[model samples]
Target: IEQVDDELLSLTAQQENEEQQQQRKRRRHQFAPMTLEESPSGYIKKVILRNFMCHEHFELELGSRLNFIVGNNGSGKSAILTAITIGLGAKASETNRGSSLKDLIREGCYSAKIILHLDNSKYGAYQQGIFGNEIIVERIIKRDGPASFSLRSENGKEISNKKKDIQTVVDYFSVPVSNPMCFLSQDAARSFLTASTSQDKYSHFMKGTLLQEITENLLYASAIHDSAQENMALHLENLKSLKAEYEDAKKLLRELNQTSAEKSLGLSQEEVIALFEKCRNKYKEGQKKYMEIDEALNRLHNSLKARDQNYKNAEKGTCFDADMDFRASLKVRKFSGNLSFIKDTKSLEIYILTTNDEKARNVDTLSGGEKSFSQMALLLATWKPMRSRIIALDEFDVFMDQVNRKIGTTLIVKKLKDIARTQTIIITPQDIGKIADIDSSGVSIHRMRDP
Candidate 1:
């Protein structure tokens, strides 16, 4: 019920109701290739096995893209694959070659060790400055003791030996060590592929594709959700009964408050009326004093009412006088973008209409290129009024293609060159000077070099 509970809590604050969002929402993860950056990291770079399998000393470097190991029966090809599983923090039970970790130690050997060199570079590099360009993961198995793990850097010094720390790196890379889908042995692969019955076949497919994991958590959530729902329903029924009791008690309280006035009123009875009658003039003066106090309260109310009108006048309309200037920029460039400030949420939302689009969707729906140009289009439009002495943009065309880059750069050049006072420095990885078809004067393009 964690999923249900979490969503319910979000519903308490968010505008979206539970019925509308939770059922349909998939918690969809974006496609990995949605971004342009690829660092060529996270894959196994090399594996070293010493006295752990058939070979005395074996070190096999892998291709980052893909690798194929082909060998005859006694070539220890399967042994290499088995060592990789154990080296990356799997148990000997996963290898199918042995029942225990100590069994993997070669004959007449006191201990065995396996090392995995992982690629660490660019965007996804984990602590690249400290771990350097590669991360080394090692496992040591002795004849009498449980196998120990070691996490190391490129320099081959142990940074940590905890199996838990190694799991972090493994999880960071999204390595499925326990999943049967990956590292399926020949026997394990054959066992599932030629299973006896359809029901059994379904198990392997579900287990392999991770429908097993999904449904397992979903089942647990379903049970927990029902349990909590039962408690809530019971509580609601109890509250229904308790509310009637509370209402009756509230009436009793009102009845008791009336009794106070009766007790005070009884102290006078009819005899008190004669004495109260003697103070009629005094009561008139008291009435006059209370009237002044009522008038004073009314005057404050009138003051607040007048002040409220002024506040309402100050915040009279959603539209601004400067909105005309903002709209004028987009219209001059043959585009239209509207700004709507939602005072309810205090958010300024931009509605963009592109050149060919029939509908103007929110700026959020636009893709990288479309969004970049739309933003830059808005910038150039608004720049007409607020042209600064110096303006800067970094990697504006990072996502744009050649045609759009050329168009935007040309537009920037033509518009800003006309404004002689403004010195604009827009940075991009692409050659902006070559892309711009226009030969605008007084615009300098400088290339930056690596240190």
Candidate 2:
């Protein structure tokens, strides 16, 4: 037996425990919270519900740092997060849980309630004089009609019942409820986290990093913008008809005025009347115009080319920094990878470099565990560009194996576990959940009841 690859294929169980201890020490040293004054603004202080979905009345107080919700398939864990969406004014369809707000009213129940306990005691607190330490937003849902929102002060004193006012608080907190990244439902989480193909991976990266928004607003718009071609010719006939109503539209109309001028070589009363009529008719056809359809199409192509160049540059330029970030996250001391944008395929190619491999491999070619590592690494990289101030993922590791699943938790925990500035809620159906093997001093876990 030879000591090759520093034990790539297999390692002594002895080495595993010892390395875990040393890695723990290394992580503790590297991870540090901000040194400035502490504040937990924009963070959800608590989640409250009553007769919503399967919950009769439940209140889950969130930790300032991390909140992990663990439950079985039928558990109403996701329903708890869905309440936050309803409380923040998301359309019922947006939750992917139901099509209408009325349907959310617990069956056989006439109404439901969703309330969010927001932190309003800090520097960026909203309407400090009006709302005190606790900014509670309540949404009352009815089976018969539309829901109503009430934004009240700390002591349950109602301030505004308008949805606009609720949006005002959501904006003040910088919580992007509309962003899919902020509150990832089960399906969205599985789709992005377990993504394998290049298109899916790249698509998730663009969305999580907000590059897709840029392309949609700038690049794609110019490329497919149709010109106002149909309206141009349609207006041409209408203009002609208005001028036809006047005799001035034809050449013979001017002929009469000319003859009247010279008949007496002077102006007479009848001649003067016809002369005045001719002058008035001349202006009737004055405003007629024709548009160039081909010209506008040419401009569309021209304007489009201008935007595509920058779009390509966006792929080349911004992709550079993101590649390095991806590399850093993939550096779990085992593999290296880079994100390559292939314009021909219109998809991202993950070029992964692993230990002892003769050449780098594409994502599709990697082993299952390596592929999971790369996928989790890409998710880490996507987190950096800032989807929002907070993040949540449902069933993050359901498709992953035990080994990389442990490592996946390692990447998430060891990295951000020390930063007390943000809140992260990770939902999993996996129980005895040390299956994730990410045990940190600051991590909080809340088990849910079955529906």
Candidate 3:
């Protein structure tokens, strides 16, 4: 009987193990690559265009997953892509299209319009009574006038049309309209690949992506710091030269007085000469004291000015240093790039570690594929702090070759999966819908036809 009981227990344990394996497989299928657990809050549900560029009237229902917009050149796909950006208050210069919003209006059309349906259902519980669960953002561009904007709710309740009011909705949704990484165009994408100068590349990556204003502020602070140092040194040298001149003048005066004292003659003329010498000596003494005091005051003033400038530099440096360190740490972990800050000539510097020599090279020294990789890494490193609800990229993968392209796409997919909230729209002329090892339920492929 004991032997029979042991056999039954062994059979039951094996059955339980098999059941657990089955459950795991089911989960893997349900959350496949192209799918995600539904996001409860906000996304661009639809986009409507009228008299915009190539579209006379058009509309598209967007998805919460990765959206791929594919079409031949001149098929009006790029027009829709730019419409999303321009409708979101992006500048015309940003789209690499026309220089003005009026230029985007179809030829001969007086005005163009774009409307976006923003779903705020789940997250709207906080302000549901006011804005409800959906907000419609409309932008109208007229040939002879500045563009106008308006906001309305699902029930057709009109909200304020002021730019400030629209901005409030943008901020609430954390839209990345201004961020280059989240929105790339063909020209901008090509420039990233072909950037020859480190300075050019640095500005593009640092100023274009992430917290551009922070870097800009830091650079301004550094300039002020360098300027102060130069001014301080110049003032000190001038003070030294002035002091030397004053000393030489005093020595000459002393020599003259001594010569006068040496001349002794028994007459009124001689006494008058001695009296004149005494007065001249007193005058020289007063002049020397005044110069010395003046120089001392100047020195004190320059010193104080230098101190104030340094204090300001140090304060700004603290902020930049903190930002740089935080960004570097994230880069090292996520992208495996060796970015660091080192003190150089009283200012901090940035360097990238080389793979072969393992030596630190100035960030400007990196170019070609190396520069591209570094810039991409730097862009991705800021993914955490960006609170953008939806990220749209227009041909971001065109810059890299096959291997690098696959690697970059994989990284993007991985990050998207990790975040699991932000929606992505990728517009490409190339056929990237069937890339290997990238079959995900969260990716949607769409083909564009001529309007």
Candidate 4:
């Protein structure tokens, strides 16, 4: 396309205007859909699990919006859920948030596998094969076995072209593995809600919010940048040698012209001067570029130092303010470590790594009930912000007192109503009769019949 001078000027003006107006015009990018309908609710089409080495194969189905599982003790409720996360592509450690793979597998099992069937009919995550979409993975822990996977389409057709395609299928609709906030296990629910040390607590919160991915990305960018710098430095040395040779050639050519008396050579003094002049000009340009490049190199070196510092600061930012923006209308607060829940995004610090505060220390040293209250407050804060379509709480208030439990459950229900459009799932054996006024829609209650 050709642009007239006037058009070009107008285009520049438009670009400037758009830059100024971006805040109002720019919207967050949302996940796209494969199927469109009058009702625009997100749905889970299905979940499939197979050949996952375990005590038994877990083939759990899911509802479009909410699927509540209630089974007797050791009925694989948590195990199945953990497997769902794994089939989504999490490493065993990431899926279970535990150290050993042995704990993730069923007792007496050497290896395990998990698979999920997502109804991507709407988003078509499986069909388009976008990032975090469509494939299969298998890990073998047996002796003399090579861990491998067989990729396939929804129709079970094998895909042999791209081996790395499995990552997409594993992380659909989730953030990077280092920072996954989507999956929360029971142990994580209780202890991580309140960590003992500052570093430990920060680590917990970071995982809950996916701070690791940002750190890792920053590290990756730095490594790539370092490689680029080394490559450029090598190229610059070669260019410098060529520049020196060019200068020597220009000087010799000038003297040669002076000695040449045969005008029959046909190359005039003017031509010789022009040639020397061109060479001199080119040499000067290259020299100037060389100096400018050095200056830029120095600037970049300084920038890298500062970026490293910032990375460290983010790594060791002892002070933190947890923010949970929920649409809830309830009051719930308690101590989580040295932090106390204030309004969403605000909290009271019990201690700073540099200097500990008595109040913050009191929080960490407080009774179990105090700690539970604080944790509940944090969850309340999150509930209001995420306005999650579905919340599956796993005995979150087991450690709290009767009053606190009532208040916590009440707040949970109230928050659900606040996000009235959302479906809430409470996974608990505790009786929540106090919140009898809570609204229940598409709510199914299941009983443990083992007793």
Candidate 5:
């Protein structure tokens, strides 16, 4: 009986094997593999530390993909993040990490230098100051501007002014450090948990953090629009000057002609003939072109003046347009009944979306997890797509539920791994058991001294 069915059994087994292989392939296809490569310029594989401590001399470098700054409660993990902020060019805030430049120096140390490994081939070989593969953007508070920095490349040379170097960093990295709302601390985590409304999160994301940096520097259509308007005033001024010159020239020519006419009319018979001959040959250079020049100048001046006013008007509406447009389409236009009207250039405010029947929630109302998610969403929505290298989230998942965090984190990691080609760092205290399956391989853990 068994021998008779051997061929049939073999066929069944083969069919089952094929189905299992197909299932595995489908699973693999659904989940993207994480493969984030640290730039090999060895530029900043990781920010290192010597004696730089909290509010003291702390030396650090952050040129790596998976940077971890683990240490005990006073071991200075926050200090490192602070140093990261300081190095990236954060000024004094409630954190006071940079309240005074001298405070950054170690108690007995002369100074604290942060090293950067710039992608010179890409960023034109950091040439601001003390250049080397190890360029140190050192800040000695006791020195010039109370803060002077220089760049270093593989080559040795002091190349740039401190301010210029910082601009270079901003240009290179597109940093976001201004908005307090975007920069969430452990305490602010609570806000994310309560932000039950979209407005709550959106408002905070828009106004609370260094988000303006992202919008103002987009280099996209609105930014270009802004640039074009900048020339409006200057164009008007030039137009005004040209108009004045044309008017004066025309007046002088008119007075000269009138004088000549009166003298010719009063001349005696012989004198009149001589006068007519002299006047006939008295054509001045450019006199024939005077009317054309005057008309051209006046027309140009008026046209430019009108254009300047239009731009000024657009500029006023842009204050509101800048934030609102980005929230929706990143374009300017009129449609249906929109939220906020352009009252004027520099002063468009957000329309109150929620009223009495439904009160609008502000950023302060958002809970910890919601705030984190919102901030992150805003970042993604507004990203320049190409220039962004990495996003660092410190302890951002503390208040999030396992499911929300997982899905949110999973989607973020997957998109970056697949779509955006960006690097994202998520730091959390609660054990996720493992970072999302897609993100686990890409994680770099930094142990901190906390309960």
Candidate 6:
């Protein structure tokens, strides 16, 4: 019976570890480089273009799952990306291609136009009252005139021609035109890889990538914060001056009152001194009693401190035990047995060592593949407060070597595959589909043809 009870306890611990691993796998990529939608409100169903850049006339149906745009050089694969950017109300300058919209018009063409259709059937029922089930966005660019815009319903009826009206639709669909990471080009992807400073890289991604509007909001909030602090400083200075003036006035009033009172007091200086001595004796007696009690109180305080330390030590044990359980479970999922951390209060120091070497190294100082592994681990460490609906990356594996690329792709694909109501679109010139770990169940590959 004793042996059977011990075996049952061990089995329960194993089951708990497995359950924790499943939960960790689900939550592991919450802060990943690519954030996916919790529930897709809508996605781009199809795109149609005429006289746009290299394409004379083109139309393609986009998949809701993994989309791979593979083609040889100059096959207009990037052009499709540009069209999607512009068709969604993004400016020409935002694309980093040309300074003007006319540059996007193909040579020997008078004007260029694009139409984007969105799948809003059941997902966008809330917008049914406005644009109905399907929303169509149209942009017309002329060589000699300003661009015209239009928003229509599924029935082909024009809702409005105003740019504000178009913006309304853009916001409704949660389009990533302004998000740099969501619409990466080859040049932009290379820039992300070659950025020197972490600040520059973060700025490049945050300024126009995932949360452009939120970044702007933080800027506005910072400006307000600065102004409020400045105003508070000024108010504090005035308060200090006022307090000083009031104190001086109070002292003067007291002196004036005391002079009048002194006139009424006929007591001699000796009598005043005698009264003072009596009060002083009483004060000394009270002081002596207070000192005796204070000494006892101090000993009591010392005893209380010992109790606090006992409680603190008990809590530390509980926390360390929790940490051990977490680490053991993490090893099951991350396949790293060397993971450990130490908590310190003085300097508040904590560190993670991914290797068995005694020498400590910052993750940033590691090689490309090593850094990639560290980055993967770090991504799982820090989770975000908010969720992203869709993530799109062009040439995602531009920097990694053959081994690192495969590892990175495998880790990312597995996480994305386990998620529902999400979409990841990766456009690469490489044969990314050949990677063995990439499950082809929910993945799709599209090859672009030369015109």
Maximum-TM-score candidate: 2
Q: What is candidate 2's TM-score against the reference? A: 0.72
Model 1 CA deviation exceeding 4 Å by range? 1-39, 91-97, 121-123, 195-203, 231-451
Model 4 earns a TM-score of 0.51
Model 3 CA deviation exceeding 4 Å by range: 1-40, 124-126, 144-146, 195-201, 209-212, 215-337, 341-375, 382-384, 449-451
RMSD, every candidate, angstroms: 22.0, 16.3, 21.3, 11.8, 21.8, 17.6
Candidate 5 weakest ten by summed lDDT = 329-338
**Compared with the true structure, what per-residue lDDT tens digits does model 5 show for residues 1-451?**
2222232234335545855886775221123243423342213344544445544333343323443334434444455555555665665664455446666666676556655444433232333333434554544343234555655444545566557557555444444544333334445545643455545544444444333344443323233333333443344455456556555444544554555454544444455445444443443323433433344344444444554565556434543443443344212111111233232432222222222325434433535544444444444443422234544445645445666576556545444444222334444554544654624454444554343
Model 4, 49-152: lDDT tens digits are 44443336644444444334554335544554555445444566555544554455555555555544443334424445431333333333322343445454
Residue 420 miss distance in model 2 (angstroms) = 4.7
Clashing pairs in 3: 33-440, 33-441, 33-442, 34-440, 34-441, 34-442, 35-441, 35-442
Ranking by TM-score, best first? 2, 3, 6, 4, 5, 1
Each prediction's whole-model lDDT (CA) = 0.55, 0.67, 0.62, 0.48, 0.44, 0.56
- Compared with the true structure, the alpha-carbon lDDT of candidate 4 equals 0.48
TM-score of 6: 0.58
Off by over 4 Å in 2: 1-40, 207-226, 229-258, 261-324, 418-421, 431-439, 449-451
Backbone clash pairs in model 3 (N, Cα, C under 3 Å; residues 3+ apart or in different chains), count: 8
In model 1, the worst 10-residue window by lDDT is: 314-323
Which is the winner by TM-score between candidate 4 and candidate 5? 4
Q: What residue runs in model 5 are displaced by over 4 Å at the alpha carbon?
A: 1-43, 55-74, 94-99, 108-110, 121-136, 140-148, 176-199, 208-379, 382-387, 417-427, 430-433, 436-442, 446-451
Ranking by lDDT: 2, 3, 6, 1, 4, 5
Q: Deviation in angstroms for 184 in model 1?
A: 1.4
